[PDB]
Design a protein around this ligand. Structure first.
Ligand SMILES: [Mg+2]
Ligand SMILES: [Mg+2]
Ligand SMILES: [Mg+2]
Ligand SMILES: [Mg+2]
Ligand SMILES: [Mg+2]
Ligand SMILES: [Mg+2]
Ligand SMILES: [Mg+2]
Ligand SMILES: [Mg+2]
Ligand SMILES: [Mg+2]
Ligand SMILES: [Mg+2]
Ligand SMILES: [Mg+2]
Ligand SMILES: [Mg+2]
Ligand SMILES: [Mg+2]
Ligand SMILES: [Mg+2]
Ligand SMILES: [Mg+2]
Ligand SMILES: [Mg+2]
Ligand SMILES: [Mg+2]
Ligand SMILES: [Mg+2]
Ligand SMILES: [Mg+2]
Ligand SMILES: [Mg+2]
Ligand SMILES: [Mg+2]
Ligand SMILES: [Mg+2]
Ligand SMILES: [Mg+2]
Ligand SMILES: [Mg+2]
Ligand SMILES: [Mg+2]
Ligand SMILES: [Mg+2]
Ligand SMILES: [Mg+2]
Ligand SMILES: [Mg+2]
Ligand SMILES: [Mg+2]
Ligand SMILES: [Mg+2]
Ligand SMILES: [Mg+2]
Ligand SMILES: [Mg+2]
Ligand SMILES: [Mg+2]
Ligand SMILES: [Mg+2]
Ligand SMILES: [Mg+2]
Ligand SMILES: [Mg+2]
Ligand SMILES: [Mg+2]
Ligand SMILES: [Mg+2]
Ligand SMILES: [Mg+2]
Ligand SMILES: [Mg+2]
Ligand SMILES: [Zn+2]
Ligand SMILES: [Zn+2]
Lengths: 202, 127, 91, 25, 97, 212, 94
RNA sequence: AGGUGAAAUUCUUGGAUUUAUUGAAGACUAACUACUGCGAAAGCAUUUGCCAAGGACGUUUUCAUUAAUCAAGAACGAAAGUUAGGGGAUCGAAGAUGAUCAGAUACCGUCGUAGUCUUAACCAUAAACUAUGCCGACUAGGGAUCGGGUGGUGUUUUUUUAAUGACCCACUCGGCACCUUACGAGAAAUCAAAGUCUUUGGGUUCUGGGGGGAGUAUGGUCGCAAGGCUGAAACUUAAAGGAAUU
């Protein structure tokens, strides 16, 4: 609850003691109760498995990846999200991989990822339609709702305050080096206005 | 007892490329273009600029001392023009006439399996 | 007989929210509430619980999927893609 | 005007005449 | 293709459908072949082959689910596995491997 | 004034033990420091060259080849293979009007784990008594030929590990096995085999190469 | 008035074919309508070639060719003089 | 380096263009390709597998008038366009621009959103062309070709023969067409149908009635929209138009 992705309680035999360990994954789209999950360097190539990235060939899709292997998952965790293996530097074993945001990172090829995409994707397409349907979304996240715009407040409350009209008054873009108290608006905005396009940087 | 090279010549319009490699090419040596031995832009692919291009290139054959070369003429190709530019058969008969000894020519203009729609629009270049 | 000429399941929302959001909400209100087939059980009896969680009513076998469909376009191709790459690694 | 752009004309005129009516009742 | 070789047994020969019934035909050496829908579970699969191991018969694994097999045996319900008792006039028993 | 040619080396290469003229030529690298070496930088490369110069006569004007170097080997390198090709000129010299053209491809593993794919191509021909000016085939023949050309090529490999067959092609042979398999369906004037290349970057398993 | 039975050019039995692009200007023309001509340039130049087989290795041998099949849109195929206006009767040949 | 009549906008020593060795993505299917094929049309071209469908031929098979053409009512319907997902390599309405020009947000150059691919919905128009309704009958020669059948001491194929399969030769039915020539038709251009018509009737559906106003108005109706379908009048004019000649 609170998360748009579905979880997956998976259990393993503890190899140093007679008991079981229930590790909690984020379910990739396609895994199901009763499925067998393989977890290691020599694990094979099917969705749901979790492998070091030097193993999987150029072009795989993985998720909940580690920036430093052993951090137990930091990337591509949201519903419908994933990353792509794009290249291997084998000597100095690091793998370059492209992310949801379009960025490209180079992470130690020993990093563990989970084959496939995170389940529950497509959640954002349906409108919320009812203000209360958002009240309920955020009642299981945090007190981040609703936002009242600064231009409605008095100047004692917000740099966008005051005025006999409702105007920001001065440029709403703030330079990254502003001090906390000032950073209300479009911080370090390298542009503004209407785009048309998308990512893949260089 | 003679060694060879790889000419990878690229005879476009508006320019002419002569560029000799190792048979690998991961190490290659001293390109000259068609615009380095003349500066006009309306005279960049002219045969007179292809002779000048083979001149300062073969002259750099024995820069650490080698002799001979193989040839690969390639026009613009790809999606565009598929036919050798002007300074092609000029820049070759130059280094033939320039004592460097050659043989085994091939045409490696990249020709598609009819793909990737081409510049110019549907009514063409209307001049 | 026929109750709504166009509004179907979104008839609950009345006239509120604007004709086009109800039509977007509609499309996925159907997918979300549709009964699907079970890959293992064969029986057309899997429908969604929470988002991305799809349980066959009998046979009780749960699988993860899209938030509103049992299977997305993306997963179906990435499934047909690692299986593409898997086949050169194994052979 | 040739036909295709004379048609584009009386498509604009036919449609501005169509919308001026809506301002009234 | 090979779908088609079955509908001749139905008028010609005799058969039974289902786990609880074909698992008898195997306990009697009288099922001359069984056919298993692809979507049937492997636990039931593994155990149904053991009987063929004892009943002295080999089995053809079907390429469709219990649904596609039913339409193939010409019925309107899921079918996990079918057993041929007498092919009568049918080509199936030569047409294997 | 750097002149990165005097300050850089010049080596040699054998590729095979198959044919006669196993040695090539040379190139440079910034002379081999503690790493940045010709040992580390060098031999991630391979080559491209023709065939008649391999085996002498000029019935062989065609045929480029690839050559994958594996490991640094003592002021030399022995480079196995990363495939081969044809000539972008002589193909165009065949495909003429008023005749059908057939073309079949296949991919096969080698029993070790090294895998590859190879193509083939043929044309129709007029019988000696033809007056029909075009010699076309019936598209049933064409796929009945495509099906049985493919059956001919895979008959060889996978009873092959990475090297095992590599031996076999050179003398322009399988063109007769296609011929005895296809001079009952349609005449067929040109048969050849244009392009191969390797795909698997598998367990290198050093002990393989030294056979050559 | 109709000018040619083959109105544009050489299509009766199809209603549609896929178009090809002019090698000069990139105009789109349906393949059957286009005017195709083979360019099989010898790879050497006018004369310019005896100078090479001196610089040649190999008892001379060489002499391969180029092969581009040329498709011309009608506008360019007339500017380029590839094709000229025939008389009203001169207009039916192959 | 680019590009061009000629240039400029663009990139490049965090090294472009060129070369190599790997890889990824998305489109497209060259050359073979044609007075060749298939489909009701719009259209349809790499491979193989599965799903049904189809004409021609052959038939000493069966039914037996079940048929032809069609208000109403339906199915499909290029490209673009709409909505929402995916996808976005390329080219590229708009836009950005650099030239040119008297001006030139035009033709040229370089970028570039939508779009271009796709799924699920719409949309129903193209010079949707053969500007030629469909069914049927008859009225000229010719040689080609695609598919099918028959025929033949005919040429090539060896398995061990033959049988096929490829080619030649006659015929044949059915096509895509083509050449000749009109007796006939016609204003002519031209037509084997546009012939078999003042010697005017085989069956049938749809459309037109001088040129504009006008596919406008109004009503209706389909569409989310763009728009589609139906569709006047007041008024106005001695012409506007076709084919051929000089
Ligand atoms: Mg609050
Ligand atoms: Mg808000
Ligand atoms: Mg607010
Ligand atoms: Mg106040
Ligand atoms: Mg302030
Ligand atoms: Mg303040
Ligand atoms: Mg204010
Ligand atoms: Mg306000
Ligand atoms: Mg230039
Ligand atoms: Mg012009
Ligand atoms: Mg116009
Ligand atoms: Mg019982
Ligand atoms: Mg059981
Ligand atoms: Mg005219
Ligand atoms: Mg037809
Ligand atoms: Mg059309
Ligand atoms: Mg570089
Ligand atoms: Mg690799
Ligand atoms: Mg690789
Ligand atoms: Mg054909
Ligand atoms: Mg093709
Ligand atoms: Mg009607
Ligand atoms: Mg449409
Ligand atoms: Mg469309
Ligand atoms: Mg979209
Ligand atoms: Mg795009
Ligand atoms: Mg503009
Ligand atoms: Mg432009
Ligand atoms: Mg562009
Ligand atoms: Mg409709
Ligand atoms: Mg019409
Ligand atoms: Mg008739
Ligand atoms: Mg025939
Ligand atoms: Mg025949
Ligand atoms: Mg016969
Ligand atoms: Mg009138
Ligand atoms: Mg009138
Ligand atoms: Mg009026
Ligand atoms: Mg109206
Ligand atoms: Mg006139
Ligand atoms: Zn189930
Ligand atoms: Zn053109």
């Amino acid at each position: 609850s609170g998360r748009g992705a579905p979880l997956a309680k998976v259990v393993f035999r503890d190899p140093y003691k007679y008991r079981l360990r229930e590790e909690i994954f984020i379910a990739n789209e396609g895994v199901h109760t009763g499925q067998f999950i393989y977890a290691g360097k020599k694990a094979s190539l099917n969705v749901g498995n979790v492998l070091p990235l030097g193993s999987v060939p150029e072009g795989t899709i993985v998720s909940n990846v580690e920036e430093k292997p052993g951090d137990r998952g930091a990337l591509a965790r949201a519903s419908g999200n994933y990353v792509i293996i794009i290249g291997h530097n084998p000597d100095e074993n690091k793998t370059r991989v492209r992310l949801p945001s379009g960025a490209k990172k180079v992470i130690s090829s020993d990093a563990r990822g989970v084959i496939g995409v995170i389940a529950g994707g497509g959640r954002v397409d349906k409108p919320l339609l009812k203000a209360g349907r958002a009240f309920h979304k955020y009642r299981l996240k945090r007190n981040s709702w609703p936002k009242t715009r600064g231009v409605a407040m008095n100047p004692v409350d917000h740099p966008h305050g005051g005025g006999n009209h409702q105007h920001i008054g001065k440029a709403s873009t703030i330079s990254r080096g502003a001090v906390s108290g000032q950073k209300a608006g479009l911080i370090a905005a390298r542009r503004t206005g209407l785009l048309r396009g998308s990512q893949k940087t260089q | 007892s003679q060694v060879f090279g790889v000419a990878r010549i690229y005879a476009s319009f508006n320019d002419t490329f002569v560029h000799v490699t190792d048979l690998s090419g991961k190490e290659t040596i001293a390109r000259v273009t068609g615009g380095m031995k003349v500066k006009a832009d309306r005279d960049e692919s002219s045969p007179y600029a292809a002779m000048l291009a083979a001149q300062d290139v073969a002259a750099k054959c024995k820069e650490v001392g080698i002799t001979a070369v193989h040839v690969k003429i390639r026009a613009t190709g790809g999606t565009r023009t598929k036919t050798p530019g002007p300074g092609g058969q000029a820049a070759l008969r130059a280094l033939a006439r320039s004592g460097l000894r050659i043989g085994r020519i091939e045409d490696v203009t990249p020709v598609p399996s009819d793909s990737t729609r081409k510049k110019g629009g549907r009514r063409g270049r209307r001049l | 007989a026929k109750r709504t000429k166009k509004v179907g399941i979104t008839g609950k929302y009345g006239v509120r929210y604007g004709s086009s959001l109800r039509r977007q909400v509609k499309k996925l209100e159907i997918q979300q509430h549709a009964r699907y087939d079970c890959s293992f059980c064969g029986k057309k009896t899997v429908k969604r619980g929470a988002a991305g969680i799809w349980t066959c009513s009998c046979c009780k076998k749960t699988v993860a999927g899209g938030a509103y469909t049992v299977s997305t376009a993306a997963a179906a191709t990435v499934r047909s893609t690692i299986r593409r790459l898997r086949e050169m690694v194994e052979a | 005007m040739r036909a295709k752009w004379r048609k584009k004309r009386t498509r604009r005129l036919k449609r501005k005449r169509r919308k001026v009516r809506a301002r009234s009742k | 293709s090979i779908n088609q070789k079955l509908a001749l047994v139905i008028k010609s020969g005799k058969y039974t459908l289902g786990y609880k019934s074909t698992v008898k035909s195997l306990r009697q050496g009288k099922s001359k072949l069984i056919i298993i829908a692809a979507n049937t579970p492997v636990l039931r699969k593994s155990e149904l082959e053991y009987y063929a191991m004892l009943s002295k018969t080999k089995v053809y694994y079907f390429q469709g689910g219990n649904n596609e097999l039913g339409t193939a045996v010409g019925k309107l319900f899921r079918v996990g596995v079918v057993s041929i008792l007498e092919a009568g006039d049918s080509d199936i028993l030569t047409t294997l491997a | 004034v750097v002149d990165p040619f005097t300050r850089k080396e010049w080596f040699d290469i054998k590729a095979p033990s198959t044919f006669e003229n196993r040695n090539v030529g040379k190139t440079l690298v910034n002379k081999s420091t503690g790493l940045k070496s010709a040992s580390d930088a060098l031999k991630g490369r391979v080559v491209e060259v023709c065939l008649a110069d391999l085996q002498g006569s000029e019935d062989h004007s065609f045929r480029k080849i690839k050559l994958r170097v594996d490991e640094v080997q003592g002021k030399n390198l022995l480079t196995n293979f990363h495939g081969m090709d044809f000539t972008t000129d002589k193909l165009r010299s065949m495909v003429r009007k008023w005749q059908t053209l057939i073309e079949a491809n296949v991919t096969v593993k080698t029993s070790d784990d090294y895998v590859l794919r190879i193509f083939a191509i043929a044309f129709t021909r007029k019988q000696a008594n033809q007056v029909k000016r075009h010699s076309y085939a019936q598209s049933s023949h064409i796929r009945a030929i495509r099906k049985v050309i493919s059956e001919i090529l895979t008959k060889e490999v996978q009873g092959s590990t990475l090297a095992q067959l590599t031996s076999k092609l050179i003398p322009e042979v399988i063109n007769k096995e296609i011929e005895n398999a296809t001079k009952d369906i349609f005449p067929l004037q040109n048969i050849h085999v244009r392009k191969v290349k390797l795909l698997k970057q598998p367990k290198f398993d050093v002990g393989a190469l030294m056979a050559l | 008035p109709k000018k040619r039975a083959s109105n544009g050019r050489n299509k009766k039995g199809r209603g549609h074919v896929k178009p090809v692009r002019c090698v000069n200007c990139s105009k789109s023309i349906p393949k059957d309508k286009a005017i195709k001509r083979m360019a099989i340039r010898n790879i050497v130049e006018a004369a310019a070639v005896r100078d090479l087989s001196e610089a040649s290795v190999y008892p001379e041998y060489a002499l391969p060719k180029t092969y581009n099949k040329l498709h011309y849109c009608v506008s360019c195929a007339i500017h380029a003089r590839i094709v000229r206006v025939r008389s009203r009767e001169d207009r039916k040949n192959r």
